[PDB]
C-alpha cells in the first residue's frame, strides 16, 4: 500500500520553479556526477548535449572532454540534469524539501512595514500648501 501521486498542473499556475531559480548544495551535484558516471558514455553524451546547447562556453569544449563545472552551470540546468538523470534512473522523485527557518518571513520584517506605513501616516494626515 503506497500513495498515488496527485494531478500536477503543467499551465494554469506556472512560474514556481521559474521565479525560484535557485543554485543547490555542491554536496547533491558533486556526488550525482558519480550517480551520471554509472550510466553508458553514450548516455552522458546526451546529458552533455543538454547542458552545451544552452552552455555557450561548454558548445565549443569537446563531448569527450567535457567538465560539468555545477558551480559555473546556470541553476535551470541543474534542475533538468536531475529530471535527465532520474528519469534514466527510473526512480521515484523521492526528495521531500523541507523549510528550516522563514529567513525573511519575521516579526522584524513586518515590524519594518508597520514602521514605514507609520513613518507616511506623518505626511498623510498634513495638509499642503495653497501655493498662490
Given at each position: 500500500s503506497m500513495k498515488t501521486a496527485p494531478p500536477a498542473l503543467p499551465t494554469g499556475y506556472d512560474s514556481e520553479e521559474e521565479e525560484e531559480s535557485r543554485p543547490m548544495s555542491y554536496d547533491e551535484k558533486r556526488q550525482l556526477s558519480l550517480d551520471i558516471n554509472k550510466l553508458p558514455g553514450e548516455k552522458l553524451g546526451r546529458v552533455v548535449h543538454i547542458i552545451q546547447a544552452r552552455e555557450p562556453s561548454l558548445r565549443d569544449?569537446?563531448?569527450?572532454?567535457?567538465?560539468?563545472?555545477?558551480?559555473?552551470?546556470?541553476?535551470?540546468?541543474?534542475?533538468?540534469?536531475?529530471?535527465?538523470?532520474?528519469?534514466?534512473?527510473?526512480?521515484?522523485?523521492?526528495?521531500?524539501?523541507?523549510?528550516?527557518?522563514?529567513?525573511?518571513?519575521?516579526?522584524?520584517?513586518?515590524?519594518?512595514?508597520?514602521?514605514?506605513?507609520?513613518?507616511?501616516?506623518?505626511?498623510?494626515?498634513?495638509?499642503?500648501?495653497?501655493?498662490?
Open positions: 569544449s569537446n563531448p569527450e572532454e567535457i567538465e560539468i563545472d555545477f558551480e559555473t552551470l546556470k541553476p535551470s540546468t541543474l534542475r533538468e540534469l536531475e529530471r535527465y538523470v532520474l528519469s534514466c534512473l527510473r526512480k521515484k522523485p523521492r526528495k521531500p524539501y523541507t523549510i528550516k527557518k522563514p529567513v525573511g518571513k519575521t516579526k522584524e520584517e513586518l515590524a519594518l512595514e508597520k514602521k514605514r506605513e507609520l513613518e507616511k501616516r506623518l505626511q498623510d494626515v498634513s495638509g499642503q500648501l495653497n501655493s498662490t
